[PDB]
Amino acid sequence: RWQEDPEPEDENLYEKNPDSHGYDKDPAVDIWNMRVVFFFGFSIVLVLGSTFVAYLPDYRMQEWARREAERLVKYREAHGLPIMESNCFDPSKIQLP
Amino acid sequence: XXXXXXXXXXXXXXXXXXXXXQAERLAIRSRLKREYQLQYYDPSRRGVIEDPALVRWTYARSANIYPNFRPNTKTSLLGALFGIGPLVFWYYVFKTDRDRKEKLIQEGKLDRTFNISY
Amino acid sequence: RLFIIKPSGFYDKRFLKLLRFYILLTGIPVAIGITLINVXXXXXXXXXXXXXXXXXXXXXXXXXXXXXXXXX
Amino acid sequence: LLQVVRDHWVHVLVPMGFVFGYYLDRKNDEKLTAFRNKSLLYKRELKPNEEVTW
Amino acid sequence: XXXXXXXXXXXXXXXXXXXXXXXXXXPRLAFVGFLGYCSGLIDNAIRRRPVLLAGLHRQLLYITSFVFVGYYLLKRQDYMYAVRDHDMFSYIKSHXXXXXXXXXXXXXXXXXXX
Amino acid sequence: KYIIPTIMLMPLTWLSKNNMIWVNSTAHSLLISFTSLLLMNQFGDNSLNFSLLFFSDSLSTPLLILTMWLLPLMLMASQHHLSKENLTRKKLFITMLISLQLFLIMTFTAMELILFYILFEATLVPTLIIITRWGNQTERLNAGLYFLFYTLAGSLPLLVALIYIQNTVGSLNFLMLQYWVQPVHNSWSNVFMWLACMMAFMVKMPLYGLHLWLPKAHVEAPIAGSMVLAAVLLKLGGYGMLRITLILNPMTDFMAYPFIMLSLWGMIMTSSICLRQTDLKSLIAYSSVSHMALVIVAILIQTPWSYMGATALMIAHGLTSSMLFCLANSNYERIHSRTMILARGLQTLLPLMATWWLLASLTNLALPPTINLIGELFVVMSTFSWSNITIILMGVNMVITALYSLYMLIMTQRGKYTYHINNISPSFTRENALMSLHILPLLLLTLNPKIILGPLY
Amino acid sequence: XXXXXXXXXXXXXXXXXXXXXXXXXXXXXXXXXXXXXXXXXXXXXXXXXXXXXXXXXXXXXXXXXXXXXXXXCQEKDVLCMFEAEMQWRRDYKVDQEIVNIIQERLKACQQREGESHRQNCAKELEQFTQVVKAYQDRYXXXXXXXXXXXXXXXXXXXXXXXXXXXXXX
Lengths: 97, 118, 72, 54, 114, 457, 169
Fold this sequence. Notes:
7 chains, B: about 0% strand, D: about 55 residues, mainly alpha, about 0% strand, membrane (chain E), mitochondrion inner membrane (chain E), transmembrane helix (chain E), respiratory chain (chain E), NADH dehydrogenase [ubiquinone] 1 subunit C2 (chain E)
């Protein structure tokens, strides 16, 4: 015996008493939510946010290193023999053993 | 799996036992179809039908695991040799490649001068 | 003439129109974004005199819109 | 005036929480004022403004 | 330290070492004040009363009591950590031989491949 | 900057009127998610600390942006569910997402290991309440108890491991301070110290052994299908393996050798089962094992190239598998079963959703450079420098990655559904809007993948 | 410009003597498209450059030099090692794009010659082999993930191997 346990109802919005909606009940709340503020974040974060991402604020010295490398190539080629790296960041270290 | 001759119409007799055998199979087939027929031809429904065959089919793989595997004997133990066994198989494959690679770096160079990435 | 096949179509085609309406709404500053390269100066590379390292933007290159975002 | 304030009350709190969050997390640099100008990485002598930049 | 050696046993406040200056509107005090406000929300759930936030004005007792006890609790916190540091620094200077300094060295270390 | 406005979302849902609620929770979350792409992106050569160690900066973690992307996305599909029940039940399970997001922001940002630990395990508590309740099918407890007794069984060994490091070597704290860390001498006492640090991120990052935690949580649906994406956030939420292996034990890789092979077989055998499986949610549950196993292989190699693909895969998987679960949810609220064979029919019944079904399935394959190709390709290239034999096994995996997603397509691209009569409306605006908000960020990462793949890039 | 080597000067001159027919179809279309949609594009580009008027030069490149050697100050100190490791990470990011320029020097030779390939150039081939081989030993490659604390060990391992060979010979 179930007594009260047998209770189930099939519910679907579809078109019946909704016209055309996404949120359940109230036509006034649905249009102002599902079509306005649902699409306002779709317009700001995706379209106005696309300008940022990586383009514009340099981003971890990606563009800076290009101009920095080019000026060091022409200077070292004119004066020194070794190009860029040969024995870098170590000069007169305190022995080995 | 297939035999020497493909089964399609081979080895079939009328007799008397086979005549009653078809009567048994068509009786259940019509019994399970009529309960579908009464549920299909009505506009008041709207909803996907359950059917006891497909629910038990999904339950056969997702569940019924621990009620099973109580007589393991030897067939279950042979599956473990095909289970954790291949991990031991590849363990000596990669290890022989490491002894080949590590020796070449220290003496008699094999790595190219053009290599720099990773 | 025939009755033809049936699709929701009304729910499908409205979604694409509602999507495009909000792309075009924020597509106006995209159109202004092209003219910002046109009207205002884009980029210049020159050796700077020793006075100040950063003013408004510390390092500005390519686009002028990079400096405007660097201030805030 | 009375209808507008009664309708929106919880809605105003979220952008107001952002201003309070931005201000409180900025003030943490005042506790970490040590080594403001040290070595040669980002150090310059003051001309008009006090302590270069916060 | 677990056992007292410099301070006298059984005391609510420090008194002997009062000079430390207690915190004024600390970030820690705001969380204890929030906990006092949180207790004034859940009491209306046990005793079924309308509105958690806009309920009875007996919540001010819950905010004050948590701040008042918490202020003395935070005063004990800043005192005990200071005594811990005071005893530690005095131990090094009294012994001297226990502590040793070593700075600026270049030593070889094994580098990993791949 | 990020904590405090996120905490102010808690009184927002409770104070607002009964008719609204869902409008305020979605709109205010979208404007906060905008500021994440505004401030966090700024970095130098080595990423400089944010402030005091309450919440710190990001060095190699733009994975916070993904959590901010799913911050409103999880609230969208949970509209169809929970709507029948009481207003207090709605307000609780919206705030449990906010509490999840509160702890999830704290995990990625804070450059720590001691305080990071009490945020890693702290994410398990809100998910436990979500998974155990609102289960459409039974055996909720055979997934709820499994959710803790797998993770906490592996993560509680971090208390004996992490504290042991700081008691001998200075303090863990900032990680930027951690240059004090000396290479391991390789001793039998140090064997279980390495294992205790790993095992916590060997359960949440699913291998082949102790992997059963994952598929049980996905099949038994928490709420509809959008709370399943929170379990996807926990796979990538176990990112501490990027921090422990790099800093705490850099010399140790001899003990990594068997654990690479354990994850290597969690690629062929995990893909074999995902071919004859009946449940549609299970087909995404086992595909999520293989994609995260690729990260596990990459981390243990420790080459600078592997991390570039590993960090990319964390973002790649988090927006593609979550996209796949939304498609499973879009059929779950119409047919009311997780059965693949029963729910069969696209274009004839679901016209515009079928194109979303394509783009989600094609991302499991190697498409023209979006993020999934970029993420996977570095791992394959890194494995060859590790050992030449790998691509003979890794290539077989590439065959069944097609079978991971084309089998999902074929069993939906058939003009049948004779037994079915429901699913009249194909997509009620937001149903397709969910699918667009998952794919269009991946399409924007085609132009700039430098923001996604960045461990010193 | 300046940094890029390139070829000296390209010849490229047509005589056109054999077969009149219609003079040259390639030359007639080149002269026609130069006035149709090339001169019009040049006029619009000049109009936008003139409309700029005021232009900001700005700092562009930052200095940041030396700031003490990393292989001098040690014994684990937060105040000293932090700025020293910053210098190494700067140079490592610069060295990544130095290789790229030398890489593109070989790319320029392959595009210009084509048929010659290996018979000519030689200077760009030698420049690539000298830098990359030195790059393999000093910066990463076999030294796993990028870390300046581990970089000193890689230099010491090369110094110990060179000293062992010099003692024998």
